[PDB]
Design a protein around this ligand. Sequence first.
Ligand SMILES: *[C@@H]1O[C@H](CO[C@@H]2O[C@@H](C)[C@@H](O)[C@@H](O)[C@@H]2O)[C@@H](O[C@@H]2O[C@H](CO)[C@@H](O)[C@H](O)[C@H]2NC(C)=O)[C@H](O)[C@H]1NC(C)=O
Ligand SMILES: *[C@@H]1O[C@H](CO[C@@H]2O[C@@H](C)[C@@H](O)[C@@H](O)[C@@H]2O)[C@@H](O[C@@H]2O[C@H](CO)[C@@H](O)[C@H](O)[C@H]2NC(C)=O)[C@H](O)[C@H]1NC(C)=O
Ligand SMILES: C/C=C1\[C@H]2C=C(C)C[C@]1(N)c1ccc(=O)[nH]c1C2
Ligand SMILES: C/C=C1\[C@H]2C=C(C)C[C@]1(N)c1ccc(=O)[nH]c1C2
Ligand SMILES: *[C@@H]1O[C@H](CO)[C@@H](O)[C@H](O)[C@H]1NC(C)=O
Lengths: 530, 535
Amino acid sequence: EDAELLVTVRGGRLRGIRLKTPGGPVSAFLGIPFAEPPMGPRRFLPPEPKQPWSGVVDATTFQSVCYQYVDTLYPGFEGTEMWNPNRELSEDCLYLNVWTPYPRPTSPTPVLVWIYGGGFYSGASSLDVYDGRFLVQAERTVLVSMNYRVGAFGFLALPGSREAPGNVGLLDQRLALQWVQENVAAFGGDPTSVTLFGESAGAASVGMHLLSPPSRGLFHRAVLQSGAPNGPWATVGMGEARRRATQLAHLVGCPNDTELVACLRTRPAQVLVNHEWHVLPQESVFRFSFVPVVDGDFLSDTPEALINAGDFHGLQVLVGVVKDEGSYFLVYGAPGFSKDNESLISRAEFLAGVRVGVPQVSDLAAEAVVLHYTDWLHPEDPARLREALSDVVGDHNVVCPVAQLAGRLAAQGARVYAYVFEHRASTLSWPLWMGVPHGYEIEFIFGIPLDPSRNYTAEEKIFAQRLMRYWANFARTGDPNEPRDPQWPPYTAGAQQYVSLDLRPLEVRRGLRAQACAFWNRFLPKLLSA
Amino acid sequence: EDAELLVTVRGGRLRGIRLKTPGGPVSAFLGIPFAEPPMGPRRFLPPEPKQPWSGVVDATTFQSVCYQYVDTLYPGFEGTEMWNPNRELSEDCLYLNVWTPYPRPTSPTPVLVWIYGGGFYSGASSLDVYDGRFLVQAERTVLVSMNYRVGAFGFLALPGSREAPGNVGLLDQRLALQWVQENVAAFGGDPTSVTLFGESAGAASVGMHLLSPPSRGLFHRAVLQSGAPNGPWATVGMGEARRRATQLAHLVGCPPTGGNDTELVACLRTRPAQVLVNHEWHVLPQESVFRFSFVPVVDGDFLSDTPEALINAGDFHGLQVLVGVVKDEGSYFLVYGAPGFSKDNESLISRAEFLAGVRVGVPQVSDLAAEAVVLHYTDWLHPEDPARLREALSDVVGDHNVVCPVAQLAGRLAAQGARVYAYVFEHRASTLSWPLWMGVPHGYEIEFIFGIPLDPSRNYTAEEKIFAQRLMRYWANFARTGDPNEPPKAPQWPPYTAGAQQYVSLDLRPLEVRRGLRAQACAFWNRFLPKLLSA
Ligand SMILES: *[C@@H]1O[C@H](CO[C@@H]2O[C@@H](C)[C@@H](O)[C@@H](O)[C@@H]2O)[C@@H](O[C@@H]2O[C@H](CO)[C@@H](O)[C@H](O)[C@H]2NC(C)=O)[C@H](O)[C@H]1NC(C)=O
Ligand SMILES: *[C@@H]1O[C@H](CO[C@@H]2O[C@@H](C)[C@@H](O)[C@@H](O)[C@@H]2O)[C@@H](O[C@@H]2O[C@H](CO)[C@@H](O)[C@H](O)[C@H]2NC(C)=O)[C@H](O)[C@H]1NC(C)=O
Ligand SMILES: C/C=C1\[C@H]2C=C(C)C[C@]1(N)c1ccc(=O)[nH]c1C2
Ligand SMILES: C/C=C1\[C@H]2C=C(C)C[C@]1(N)c1ccc(=O)[nH]c1C2
Ligand SMILES: *[C@@H]1O[C@H](CO)[C@@H](O)[C@H](O)[C@H]1NC(C)=O
């Protein structure tokens, strides 16, 4: 019996598994329960702490994936399938995973906590691209990742009601962070050095923990990759959440909040999932049905409001974006777009595309978008129209909300580092026109290129090692920089400096799409208020 | 008596004068009466045709400048005083000038008609920079220029009333054009080949003659230099013209506000000219630059609808137009009110001065509209750089008032039947007295078009004399053929169209073809901003 793979936590005893990497072994504890199964009467409710167990919990394999929609846009295509559930779906899904060096650290080790981010409707800690073994081995941190409820199960809200208060998937995350505070020391982790990192909806999640005081005491540093809590997709108003929840009930044969939720509770999980997309108010891309709601509780105000009012002295943040944030989303509803052609669209498609990529705004607001994103010397060139609509969706949804967050945080006391990730993976299965799409820096951060059975280049492995070092440096010291030899400067509202991350050495540049983001962040809100 | 200097027009006999020019003699008939003097009871009224006369009228020197405000911003400074009256002020000013080759052409010769344009408030055909002798000598055309009423005397309007119907200054221009039709043949001119050209308010005037059917039959081609009838300064609505007229009257004691229109106008008619002028600038709704108190009014008469509407509804087949701007349309205007600006320093302004200047340069729009201007003209990587801010405010004023109105006109005309040629004038005269930061300001292509550098008493470089000859050739070629191109191996000037949007750079180097008249900027002013003002 291997003693390194036996751990006792507050709830009881666990048995882990030894994992191999090209650099040596790692200890892994997978499928550790942190909450009571949120089933039956517990669907839509805040998570309850896992009651203590007797015996030894088998923690050698990933647990079930939280019930969610399965992407069938391109059946059998790696580009979409790598994000789909790779374990059975279940509402009994509140488990987390701990990876630690082998043998276990005998002294307090810095902790990284990963939050996955498929638009709050999808994701799992078990996805191959989130394999913690390489980061933990190379950088000697403790890595934790958790499953949290998504879609209706995590975010359906009838605001004010006790039966479906909203944001429960976020509370799942907070519970797991509490679990980390109380139990990570048993693995060698240092609960006084916990860095949150997340991508997309996971990045929005991290930002939300920053702005919610009960969570703020559970970690120390934050990394937000291609996502921000002030994103136009990341929250929904009380009224619109109530309407979406109400339409879901109607669509599945249910009728008073109590009676409505009770009837929803009798429905099979899959039935809810089958009608998830139908509650959106219009055809769109980069919009999701069930997301965090501003209700006065978890978020006492809108993320924008909470951001502007915040004192962020003592906070270090790492934020950044990929080179082509918008491209991926275009194939899910923008007219003329497909991974299977050049997607060289026409002006008319571009214009219809703008209403899809910027849904629910006035005709005037749309016209303003078209003004800023048209090259009036080349108003009808298909290649430029393709690039421009990608820019619209990417700026509006990701780049500009991240830039706004970064600027406010920097100006209000936080030390901020910003990056643009510009490397297109040699193994990327998406077409060349998509460039470096959303989500495709993650495999480098997790050091997936070090996996021998995969086809990455020697250069790419070295690059992955650089990135793991930046991320782990940040977790350890709040500063990604290595000892001097080209330096990564902090981002500030004025100088707006960030670095490019690719195969070349760090290059320092200015402005996260400053011209475009002035529009989304300064002008467009004024317009919409009148 | 010299037979070349004697001419009989419908109204009676004329005696002219023989002018020396560096390249030979020209006949000039200066100060020909074309209307009865708009004096006393005729103030604010449409012009009456000049009654025939017995004997010989001496047309041998320029007549009076129409009563107007005199620029006192920089007393003594050549850059401003070159535009100031160089004859006595008088309401007796309805005189035109004709220059013809010596000896008088044997066969009918194409005619250029010049219209000056100091914002509808100033200007005169007598200005040194409008001397027609050099054009006529170089290119053997006939040149005509006229004085027309400016300021209140030309454009004060109480819409609806017979006593001050508005647009009488434009009626002055039209009467002169009618005169050209009836009389220019007597000077050897061809009434079937008349090309109008004007700069600033003159350009806008030319545009209005294009959009007003009774004027449209009096000419065949048009040249609009740094102005357009659709500019935000060039017309005013009926209600705003009434408000301005009424406040002027009120400021000078009429009546002893509003009331009977006939009575209010009768009271205004008893006021000395200079009294009206002293209060001209006071009727503007806010502090501004590039805004003028009394301008053409959309009356439903001379202009049946807004120039924008008329341009859009127009069929312009069989029309040739030459349009253009200088390199720095906005700079001249900034020293007349934009905080931080002066000809006497670098005008390196602060961000706060920039924001304030935006409201001066784009007066009377919503805060939201102003915010939109700030958005498009701020460089968000250098939002506070003084030099960039100075240039940005210049571009705001130039784009909003000149470049974008001209581009909109040019695009609509081309798409609706007209052959259009477009230019940007990029030479800064060696003799320019304005500071270097102003670049090539509004109005500074004129001296080259008229061939002023050929004047021996002036100190232009030899290159500039070559340049002037080139421009005079383009202008006259256009007058003659409707096409500025030489009727060889010289680079060609292509038509401007809505799609390719091609134009030429006019400077000391040969023609260079380019695309887009500030296209990104002008999409904001011409396509977006109006949608914002509605909603
Ligand atoms: C590129 O493809 C899009 C998407 O269409 C799908 O993918 C293609 C590879 C092919 O399998 C199509 O038949 C698929 O429907 C094309 O946009 C569609 O065009 C069809 C007509 O062929 C039209 O009925 C649909 O409405 C369009 N779908 C969308 C997403 O708008 C597009 O024409 C292709 N562009 C090219 C040819 O460059
Ligand atoms: C540049 O000049 C402007 C205009 O001021 C005038 O011109 C100067 C050359 C100098 O001769 C001044 O005395 C003139 O009054 C300056 O702006 C003015 O600043 C003063 C107070 O300092 C103020 O009373 C005026 O209202 C201002 N005028 C305007 C139109 O803003 C400006 O400060 C000068 N820039 C410099 C020196 O950097
Ligand atoms: C590019 C693929 C993506 C990214 C964003 C979203 C919103 C959905 C997605 N399929 C997905 C699904 C699950 C997940 O964990 N991350 C992501 C990231
Ligand atoms: C650059 C100087 C100008 C230009 C525009 C205006 C409006 C006034 C001005 N002083 C002026 C005055 C009289 C005139 O005939 N033209 C002009 C052109
Ligand atoms: C205005 O006053 C005059 C002066 O007597 C008068 O003749 C005229 O009819 C009046 N017009 C109107 C419309 O009141």
